[PDB]
């Protein structure tokens, strides 16, 4: 139990004690460009902390700075993902040592100030939280927060113990901890996470040493003593024993299940537990409870799932994984968007938000103005929130040129298409514009189901034709499904791949096939629900099984947004792809349920009536007559079987897309399923859900095969596992 | 081996929270006053044979802390060899104190035992003792904690009980409580609370509103709905009961139990203890049982607890003459009536907690003493006492008039 | 009728107040961990036969409020038909939970019952539940309230026990507790407290100071004397014991019980319940008794409680092989030894609360489980368990190895 991990890595901290006795610890990791909490940092901080305890006589203050672009970000994800349940001892001792170093730096009896130049994420803020004073530079792009919950972990370096002490249980949980909210340096000072702000980063350290000289002279007793280390400390909002908090304290876990909708996500409940159980005891005991909960998550499967998808899979896609293996760079000078609907308007926004000159075009100059107005009601609601200025927002709306004339595309080197799914329509619309724009222009098409191979036959330069499937709403949905046609050039992939990164979105590469990958897998999801409804399952259970599985929207509710008559046409197109090939089409039992609602005149919310009942443009409960139509309640299977049916049907269909070449890697399958079809993040993706499965039959791919065979022996042959993972 | 008999059973009038007559009386004084009444009824009783004094208390904090049963033994002048223990089983703490006392007698290791409960909710509010499951996030999240208020609305929504149905039961409870006081059924049982000088403080269950109308209950608001929609307990309860779409908030202030003060005492002993002390038995404990159901609904407990005590005693529903379920919520009683097909002429014949109030720690002993005196008035044989318990628990007790 | 048998008896290591290992563990987790151990010992046990879970708790407030027994049943995954009740009889709450469980079995109305107690004194200090008699002036004045600390000094002053005498008993308690751990008598009984990951937190009674010397105890100060001289409880105690001139303050921190955390569980059931569940009995509850003495001394209770349980079971002091009195104070044990002429080779053979600590709610079950395992090691027959209770009470229990 020391300051070091062992009782030969590099050194990551500099030392500088001026003639006034103010030590300046400048973190500067040589092996990388980001100060990350690794094994080399723990040894460097131990040598620097032990030196502070030995030289405390000739020291009057400490300033913690950094020499990178950012302050300090995250931790060693390579190691936390490998920690097995038997490694919980080393995981517990490691975070205990990291907090023992901070607790010594915190209780040093001298002012310790943090100079936050850039990002302070995860373990970065937890070092600043251990400081008595915090100064942040108001540089755009600097973030401050504890986003450990996104990776399935909790801030186990004093983040929970100190944020609860600074703001209270209620404030710190909902605003800082439970969602991993990232804050600007201006918003951070607003809530108390930052105490002072400076214009540039050069003002940081001289102001930190000026604050220490002021704190020592004006407050000699309380210098270097945190508010919770004083005698009369009173936690904001009270401890769990005070009457004010104890009256509303039972509502905290219930409000958490209300937000998470009963999803099996163990991280947000562990954060709430360590937050309350830490307020009942002292800091040093609270610091140890925070560690025991942290080691419980690291050795768990859900954390390894999220760390695999939200870190390794995301950094691999942004690295250029599924990019063409070797291609150069070609810029974009003018973007042309066809159609001013809900899709074409948002595309013109996210393109113009990245500073791209957009020439929006619909059939009419009237609707083209209403297409730009979609982005106007996005900048106005952003101007009300104070995130952008009037100068920048007027430059964004100045790049979009709505029009109805086809010759205005003269000079466009990147075309976007966003009209209905009609092959003869897309053939003529592209035919009116192919000879107008630059010859090098990319001919992109935002398509849902229509194959890109057939759509490319309507243009002369088929190598420049490609599919760019966005997602509604375009301003927030970050996935872009890039469909690769048979004629599509390899350069066309890179030009669109680089464009997606330029607009801050995550791309995936998909080979042309039926339903692509998102629309193909999300269909099996809504089909499994409609299958249950036809089997006599209660509709209220299907909506709970959908939300408890981890989906953002229940399936029947999604089956109303996705027009019920639109899905009937998808089954018609699939019934044509097989019976025009000779084979006998085997229809899914959900297709008969769709036509049963079509015959009743309830084909989704668009008609004003589907599975729910709608009034004044608002969803108002389920249809009362839905139970008599399908004899609901006649079959009552376990809820865990319903959850596994909607999850396996998507995991099995994802595995088929990997074999059929629809997807190249599993990183595009995991990230593509989450950021697109809405797959539960606790699974880490639809492909990760197979190898990371955990149930009452085992763990891993082997247990997935047994459970899939168990579901197939009771709910149809469609649940049998493919050969790519069988035995 | 030994047979447990109820020799006495008394209780105090039930006050109220807002401007209650018993808000000035310490809860220790409520237990002492009932002990003083037992001496008034049997002055030549050797209190050294009293082996234990068992009290039920759901919030044993402050005035009710420190083994109030022992504080009642010392402050009333009882022999110091009478012990005293306070147990907490939520709303059934009073009935379980009677059960524990009766089971102590059958063991032959105790002769004569006092049992009952006490709860001054106007001085010690409900939940003042904290909560191991409600306040702990890890426990509140793991086991789905949704307060009893919503669990009643969920039963009514599941079993199909309308707002008029629960108001129809709350009305007859106000009537049968007013019919019981007018006929003087409680004159022998209820012991008026008098101060030190002897001046009267309260002599009647003052939470009653006997002039209640069907139209007056419908004008009320479900104060149980805002706490559910704001706290988020509606969605939590529906996550386990996934086959229910919407919770119908039917429970208001006029069809739920009242927050009142009170205390009750029951004298239990063996046949040899009563003969030696010159006491005649008034009832005999046939059998007791403890079971439970799901904790999310929290109130389906009295259904399997009644089935367990009936099969253990070798009886059926037809063999029982009176059923007494604590009227914590109206839908709880209608649920119990539908599960076992109970004729409502045998279900809370002298009203219940909806009109007269529900003191948490003492209700189990109050409704027991009500059934002992009613078996004698009706000259009936068997009576069954049940209570719905927080945490999805259930306790039932069968008594037989002797 | 039915015979009550002890099938299992386990406990946790006892922490300490100042920088205790169990200060981070919620008391609910201490009861759950022992339930997890019982499943580890009997995985093929139908827990639906478990009729009740009775826990003793002297300060049921905050972490220990809200029927922690029920919170232990729901949070451990036990069947919801297992009930749960928390009773408070001061220091004997754990033993009375065993007594109430055993008396429940003899009544035939319960099959298999868990019993024990829990008290995290480092998180919930003693007296946090308030006090009906201590804080009420009318009750504190009428019945003469003088804390247990002075009552021990009064017994030593009355019975003529010197400072060296109580230090001679506190020394042998530190030795016989160190001799018990070295010989491994507690290896089967004590269940180490492990966290969620399984990492060890505490595996030994850490309040012990086995390197205690006779000269080290004499250097201590009676912290029991300043509170008596300032609060004025010396003169109050001497007003009833008027034949005593001066109170000799002999009790310090080294010869009194320690303020420690801990929890214990005992599995009790009928012979038919154990045969059906594949369990073999380890001991049999012969008889229990509840008596008491004067509340001003507060600790002369275990003397008539032992005489009552011996005459009821038809035995004498010579018929008992082991005596186990809770070492709340040294003079309390020397008093009990002199009243009944007990050979000190039969009195707390494996140490006691002076060395290993005294968790209020769980000590009665801890020292009981110590006597069950010691009757098997010694291959003896009968053992008698007693505790001194606040309020001048006393509870004794005789067990017989089977």
Curated annotation (Swiss-Prot), chains B, C:
A GO molecular function assigned to this protein is:
acetyl-CoA C-acetyltransferase activity
InterPro entries found in the cross-reference section: Thiolase, Thiolase-like, Thiolase_acyl_enz_int_AS, Thiolase_AS, Thiolase_C, Thiolase_CS, Thiolase_N
Is Aminoacyl-tRNA synthetase one of the keywords UniProt gives this record?
no
Q: What is this protein called?
A: Putative acyltransferase Rv0859
Chain's gene name: fadA
Family annotation (CDD domains) = thiolase (cd00751)
Q: Which domain of life is it from?
A: Bacteria
In short, the EC number is 2.3.1.-
What PTMs does it carry? Pupylated at Lys-188 by the prokaryotic ubiquitin-like protein Pup, which probably leads to its degradation by the proteasome.
- What family is reported? Belongs to the thiolase-like superfamily. Thiolase family.
Annotated active site residues, numbered on this chain, are 91 (acyl-thioester intermediate), 358 (proton acceptor), 388 (proton acceptor)
PROSITE patterns named among the record's database cross-references? THIOLASE_1 (PS00098), THIOLASE_2 (PS00737), THIOLASE_3 (PS00099)
| Pfam families, sorted | Thiolase_C (PF02803), Thiolase_N (PF00108)
Q: Where is this cross-link: Isoglutamyl lysine isopeptide (Lys-Gln) (interchain with Q-Cter in protein Pup)?
A: 188
GO CC annotation terms, alphabetical: peptidoglycan-based cell wall; plasma membrane
Q: Which UniProt keywords apply?
A: Acyltransferase, Isopeptide bond, Transferase, Ubl conjugation
């Amino acid at each position: 139990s020391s300051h070091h991990h062992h009782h030969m890595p590099d050194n990551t901290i500099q030392w500088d004690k001026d003639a006034d006795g103010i030590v300046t610890l400048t973190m500067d990791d040589p092996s990388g460009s980001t100060n990350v909490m690794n094994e080399a940092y723990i040894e460097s901080m131990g040598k620097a902390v032990d030196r502070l305890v030995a030289e405390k006589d000739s020291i009057t203050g400490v300033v913690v700075a950094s020499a990178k672009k950012t302050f300090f970000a995250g931790g060693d994800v390579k190691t936390m993902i490998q920690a097995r349940p038997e490694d919980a001892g080393d995981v517990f001792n490691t975070v205990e040592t990291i907090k023992r170093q901070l607790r010594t730096l915190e209780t040093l009896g001298k002012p310790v100030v943090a100079a936050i130049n850039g990002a302070a994420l995860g373990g970065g803020l937890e070092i600043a939280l251990a400081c008595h004073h915090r100064i942040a530079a108001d540089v755009k792009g600097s973030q401050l927060g504890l986003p450990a919950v996104t990776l399935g972990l909790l801030p186990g370096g004093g983040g929970v113990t100190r944020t609860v002490r600074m703001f209270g249980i209620q404030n710190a949980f909902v605003s800082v901890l439970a969602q991993g909210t990232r804050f600007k340096p201006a918003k951070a000072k607003e809530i108390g996470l930052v105490d002072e702000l400076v214009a540039t980063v050069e003002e940081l350290v001289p102001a930190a040493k000026a604050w220490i000289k002021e704190e020592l002279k004006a407050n000699p007793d309380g210098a270097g003593v945190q508010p919770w280390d004083k005698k009369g400390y009173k936690m904001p909002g009270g401890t769990p024993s005070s009457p004010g908090l104890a009256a509303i304290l039972p509502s905290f876990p219930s409000n958490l299940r209300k937000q998470l909708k009963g999803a099996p996500m163990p991280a947000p409940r562990a954060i709430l537990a360590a937050a309350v159980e830490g307020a009942q005891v002292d800091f040093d005991t609270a610091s140890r409870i925070e560690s025991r909960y942290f080691a419980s998550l690291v050795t768990g499967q859900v954390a390894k799932n999220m760390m695999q998808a939200f870190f390794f899979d995301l950094q691999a896609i942004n690295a250029g994984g599924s990019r063409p293996e070797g291609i150069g760079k070609t810029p974009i000078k003018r973007i042309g968007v066809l159609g001013a609907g809900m899709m074409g308007a948002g595309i013109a926004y996210v393109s113009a938000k990245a500073g791209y000159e957009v020439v929006l075009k619909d059939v009419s100059l009237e609707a083209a103005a209403k297409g730009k107005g979609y982005s106007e009601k996005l900048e106005a609601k952003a101007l009300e929130r104070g995130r952008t200025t009037q100068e920048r927002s007027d430059a964004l709306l100045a790049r979009i040129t709505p029009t109805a004339d086809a010759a205005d595309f003269k000079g466009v080197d990147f075309v976007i298409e966003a009209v209905f799914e009609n092959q003869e329509l897309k053939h003529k619309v592209f035919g009116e514009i192919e000879d107008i724009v630059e010859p090098n222009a990319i001919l992109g098409s935002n398509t849902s189901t229509l194959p890109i191979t057939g759509l490319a036959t309507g243009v002369k330069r088929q190598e420049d034709f490609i599919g760019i499937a966005f997602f509604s709403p375009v301003d927030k949905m970050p996935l872009v499904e890039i469909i690769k046609g048979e004629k599509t050039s390899d350069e066309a992939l890179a030009r669109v791949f680089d464009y997606t990164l330029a607009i801050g979105k995550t791309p995936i590469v998909v080979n042309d096939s039926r339903g692509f990958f998102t629309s193909r897998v999300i269909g099996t999801f809504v089909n499994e629900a409609l299958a249950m409804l036809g089997e006599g399952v209660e509709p209220a259970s299907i909506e709970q099984a959908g939300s408890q599985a981890g989906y953002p929207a229940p399936p029947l509710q999604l089956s109303d947004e996705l027009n019920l008559e639109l899905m009937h046409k998808i089954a018609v197109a699939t019934r044509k792809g097989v019976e025009d090939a000779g084979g006998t089409y085997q229809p899914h039992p959900a297709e008969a349920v769709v036509e049963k609602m079509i015959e009743l005149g309830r084909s989704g919310r668009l008609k004003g009536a589907g599975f729910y009942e709608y009034a004044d443009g608002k969803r108002s409960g389920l249809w009362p007559g839905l139970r008599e139509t399908f004899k609901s309640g006649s079959s009552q299977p376990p809820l865990q079987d319903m959850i596994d049916r909607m999850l396996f049907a998507e995991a099995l269909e994802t595995q088929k897309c990997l074999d059929e070449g629809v997807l190249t890697s599993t990183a595009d399958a995991n990230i593509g399923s989450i950021m697109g079809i809405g797959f539960p993040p606790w699974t880490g993706g639809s492909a990760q859900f197979i190898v990371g499965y955990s149930g009452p039959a085992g763990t891993g791919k082997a247990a997935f095969v047994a459970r899939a065979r168990e579901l197939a022996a009771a709910y149809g042959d469609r649940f049998l596992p493919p050969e790519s993972l069988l035995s | 081996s030994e047979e447990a008999f109820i020799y006495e059973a008394i209780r105090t009038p039930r006050g109220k929270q807002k401007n209650g007559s018993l808000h000035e009386v310490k809860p220790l004084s409520l237990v002492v006053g009932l002990i003083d009444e037992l001496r008034k009824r049997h002055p030549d009783l050797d209190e050294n044979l009293i082996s234990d004094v068992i009290l039920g208390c759901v919030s044993p904090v402050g005035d009710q802390g420190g083994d109030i049963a022992r504080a009642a033994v010392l402050a009333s002048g009882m022999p110091v060899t009478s012990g005293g223990v306070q147990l907490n089983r939520f709303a059934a703490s009073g009935l379980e104190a009677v059960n524990t006392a009766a089971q102590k007698v059958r063991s032959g290791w105790d002769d004569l035992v006092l049992a009952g409960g006490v709860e001054s909710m106007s001085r010690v509010p409900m939940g003042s003792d904290g909560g191991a499951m409600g306040l702990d996030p890890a426990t509140n999240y793991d086991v789905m904690f949704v307060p009893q208020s919503i669990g009643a609305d969920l039963i009514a929504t599941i079993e199909g009980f309308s707002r008029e149905d629960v108001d129809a039961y709350a009305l007859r409870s106000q009537q049968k409580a007013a019919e019981a006081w007018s006929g003087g059924y409680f004159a022998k049982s209820v012991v008026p609370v008098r101060d030190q000088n002897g001046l009267l403080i309260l002599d009647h269950d003052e939470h009653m509103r006997p002039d209640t109308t069907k139209e007056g209950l419908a004008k009320l608001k479900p104060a149980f709905e805002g706490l559910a929609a704001l706290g988020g307990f509606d969605d939590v309860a529906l996550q386990k009961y996934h086959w229910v779409e919407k919770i119908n908030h039917v429970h208001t202030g006029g069809n739920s139990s009242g927050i009142v003060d009170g205390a009750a005492l029951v004298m239990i002993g063996s046949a040899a203890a009563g003969k030696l002390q010159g006491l005649t038995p008034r009832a005999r404990i046939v059998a007791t049982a403890t079971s439970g159901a799901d904790p999310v609904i929290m109130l389906t407990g009295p259904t399997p607890a009644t089935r367990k005590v009936l099969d253990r005693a070798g009886l059926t529903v037809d063999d029982i003459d009176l059923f007494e379920l604590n009227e914590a919520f109206a839908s709880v009683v209608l649920k119990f009536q539908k599960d076992l097909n109970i004729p409502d002429e045998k279900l809370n014949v002298n009203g219940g907690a909806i009109a007269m109030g529900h003191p948490l720690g003492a209700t189990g002993a109050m409704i027991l003493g009500t059934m002992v005196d009613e078996l004698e008035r009706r000259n009936a044989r068997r009576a069954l006492i049940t209570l719905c318990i927080g945490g999805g628990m259930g306790v039932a007790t069968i008594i037989e008039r002797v």
